Amino acid sequence: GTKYVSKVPDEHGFIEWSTEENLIWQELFTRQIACIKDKACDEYHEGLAKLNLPTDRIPQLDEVSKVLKVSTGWECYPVPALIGFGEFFRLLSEKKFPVATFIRSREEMDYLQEPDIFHEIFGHCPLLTNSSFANYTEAYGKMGLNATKEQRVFLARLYWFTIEFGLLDTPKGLRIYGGGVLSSPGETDYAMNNTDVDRKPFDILDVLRTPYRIDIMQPIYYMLTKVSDLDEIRKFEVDDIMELVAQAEALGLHEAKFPVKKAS
Amino acid sequence: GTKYVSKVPDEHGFIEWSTEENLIWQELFTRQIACIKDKACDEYHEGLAKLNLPTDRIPQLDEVSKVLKVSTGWECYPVPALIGFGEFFRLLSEKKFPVATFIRSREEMDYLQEPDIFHEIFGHCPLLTNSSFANYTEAYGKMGLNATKEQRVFLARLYWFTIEFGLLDTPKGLRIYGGGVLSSPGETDYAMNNTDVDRKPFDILDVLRTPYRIDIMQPIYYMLTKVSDLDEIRKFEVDDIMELVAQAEALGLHEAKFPVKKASLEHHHHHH
Ligand SMILES: [Fe+3]
Ligand SMILES: [Fe+3]
């Protein structure tokens, strides 16, 4: 693998990216924009218009935050390369999106497990300019603040099937809003085109009961009809979310798909 | 149960299986006999007819060995613990097929990573009555006896794509000879039916160059046209095989498919 470390912003929040690091961003950006023109959802494209990201260099977090602040009151928040659940929920609940300030190696161009700066800024930040998606993400952070270990595992699952791997069943066809898909050519092609994979209508109980593995091709995706469908879960009180978590736990998980059974 | 303490044969070689263990065998057998009806290759069905396995209890190793002995000179060889690569090669070179003396728990019915007695007896043993498949397995064991650590990695890759996950491209459609597929409903359905996987004609150099991961749905399969196609590989001298390994290394591995890139690297301490 590779062990990455956040670059430390100077006293102004400035990070000195190298010409090599900018070239890696440029390659990732130009391969992906091409991948998603007719695959990312309309809401995500509108978010790219609002961010107006540089195509040829890694943006300073302040340039992204300026836009997030205008649009939904959010900001990018520089963190170390690994943070715990506690910190993650807390920052989201304060409308601070954690961003580790490193970019992948050349060797790991096609895939890495760690979320790097291209994954966070290209994959997730465009939708944080969308009120529905940003307010949902804020509500998600709140959900986790007083969650037990067991509750946090159900919450991570809701996150996985929405913010990371969410799809839409739109009037113009299947589209993508999950950032895990958006930032990856391999994930985009599989989510859009794989013949046999299960794409199911979103149902919060079904989602909370779905086991998943992070290092396999996903055998199940859930589809909203539009990003604003997240308003329904946004609107639940935390107590309502925990009742749904208690329902999932009491029922136990759905039987795992075969690839999930198999994963180490 | 079978966890923590795998079974040791008594002084007569007899293993006492519980009514629950026998019921697990019966459920595994009945479900698989239905899964492989027109999917397992003819050579495999012929081997089932030779073994006459019991459908409702775990067979004693001797009841299988006695039939392997008369058909191809093979036997089942009980192992109470995973053995090393060196010992695995040595056993195959002696026409001894290692069989772990345990059956999966009920909870693990549909899948377990460690090969159990059902995987070995149902998945592999019917083909060990077939002369082409048996002779190839013996030759494979001979290939590893003086192999280096890296050469053994290439040999395991060859084994994976033949004995474990081999398919046939037949005039009657796609069939299965790999034991990892034959003993699993999930593997059988995916190997026969999944439309996006890459099913390639067998070529030994391609096979030696293909990265793979044990814990994922396989992105690539290799197809013979008949089990007796293994005769071509069996006939090589060990030096010929090591020449092919060196050629593979000179070319380097094929680029990994995306699922292989994504999978967790895993060290295998024991042989498939
Ligand atoms: Fe992400
Ligand atoms: Fe096997």
UniProtKB/TrEMBL annotation, chain A:
GO terms for molecular function: iron ion binding; phenylalanine 4-monooxygenase activity. InterPro entries: ArAA_hydroxylase, ArAA_hydroxylase_Fe/CU_BS, ArAA_hydroxylase_sf, Aro-AA_hydroxylase_C_sf, Aromatic-AA_hydroxylase_C, Phe-4-hydroxylase_mono. Fe(3+) binds at residues 119, 124, 164. Pathway: Amino-acid degradation; L-phenylalanine degradation; acetoacetate and fumarate from L-phenylalanine: step 1/6. Fe cation binds at residues 119, 124, 164. One of its GO terms (biological process) is L-phenylalanine catabolic process. Residues 1-264 form the Biopterin-dependent aromatic amino acid hydroxylase family profile domain. Its EC number is 1.14.16.1. It comes from the Bacteria. The keyword Metal-binding applies. Belongs to the biopterin-dependent aromatic amino acid hydroxylase family. This is Phenylalanine-4-hydroxylase. It comes from Colwellia psychrerythraea (strain 34H / ATCC BAA-681) (Vibrio psychroerythus).
From TrEMBL, chain B:
The keyword tRNA processing does not apply. Residues 1-264 form the Biopterin-dependent aromatic amino acid hydroxylase family profile domain. Pathway: Amino-acid degradation; L-phenylalanine degradation; acetoacetate and fumarate from L-phenylalanine: step 1/6. Fe(3+) binds at residues 119, 124, 164. It comes from the Bacteria. It comes from Colwellia psychrerythraea (strain 34H / ATCC BAA-681). GO terms for molecular function: iron ion binding; phenylalanine 4-monooxygenase activity. Pfam families: Biopterin_H. The keyword NAD does not apply. Fe cation binds at residues 119, 124, 164. Keywords: Iron, Metal-binding, Monooxygenase, Oxidoreductase, Phenylalanine catabolism. PROSITE patterns: BH4_AAA_HYDROXYL_1, BH4_AAA_HYDROXYL_2. Belongs to the biopterin-dependent aromatic amino acid hydroxylase family. One of its GO terms (biological process) is L-phenylalanine catabolic process. Its EC number is 1.14.16.1. This is Phenylalanine-4-hydroxylase. Its cofactor is Fe(2+). It catalyses: (6R)-L-erythro-5,6,7,8-tetrahydrobiopterin + L-phenylalanine + O2 = (4aS,6R)-4a-hydroxy-L-erythro-5,6,7,8-tetrahydrobiopterin + L-tyrosine. It is an enzyme of class 1 (oxidoreductase).
